[PDB]
Amino acid sequence: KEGFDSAEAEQQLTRLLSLRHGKKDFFTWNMDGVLKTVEKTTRTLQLFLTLVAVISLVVG
Amino acid sequence: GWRQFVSGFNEALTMAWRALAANKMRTLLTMLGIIIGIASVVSIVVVGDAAKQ
């Protein structure tokens, strides 16, 4: 929750599970950050498209 | 006759150069309006095709 970053806490949980279990093992895959980057990607596409469009329109 | 049509092409090519000479600046803004357009056309076509490649 919190809007909290996926990049954080997983390392906290990393040591956490490295503790509650005697050895690192959980080997979990990262969340949300992939959503973060794909969001940046799609919005980036919005940037390219909308910007070139609007520039062309200004040229109009 | 097509003789006066092609002679029309080149002689009114000269007449065109003169009419543009009447407004080189207007001609400039006009042609630029063309240029940015088509250049952007081929631009986006090629780049999109390339990224697609």
UniProtKB/Swiss-Prot annotation, chain B:
Identification of the protein by name: Macrolide export ATP-binding/permease protein MacB
Organism in which the protein naturally occurs: Escherichia coli (strain K12)
Known partners and oligomeric status: Homodimer. Part of the tripartite efflux system MacAB-TolC, which is composed of an inner membrane transporter, MacB, a periplasmic membrane fusion protein, MacA, and an outer membrane component, TolC. The complex forms a large protein conduit and can translocate molecules across both the inner and outer membranes. Interacts with MacA.
Residues included from the entire protein: 246 to 298 of 648
TM stretches of this protein: 28-48
Family, as annotated: Belongs to the ABC transporter superfamily. Macrolide exporter (TC 3.A.1.122) family.
Localization in the cell: Cell inner membrane
Function field: Part of the tripartite efflux system MacAB-TolC. MacB is a non-canonical ABC transporter that contains transmembrane domains (TMD), which form a pore in the inner membrane, and an ATP-binding domain (NBD), which is responsible for energy generation. When overexpressed, the system confers resistance against macrolides composed of 14- and 15-membered lactones but no or weak resistance against 16-membered ones. In addition, the system could also transport R-LPS or a similar glycolipid.
Gene name, Swiss-Prot/TrEMBL: macB
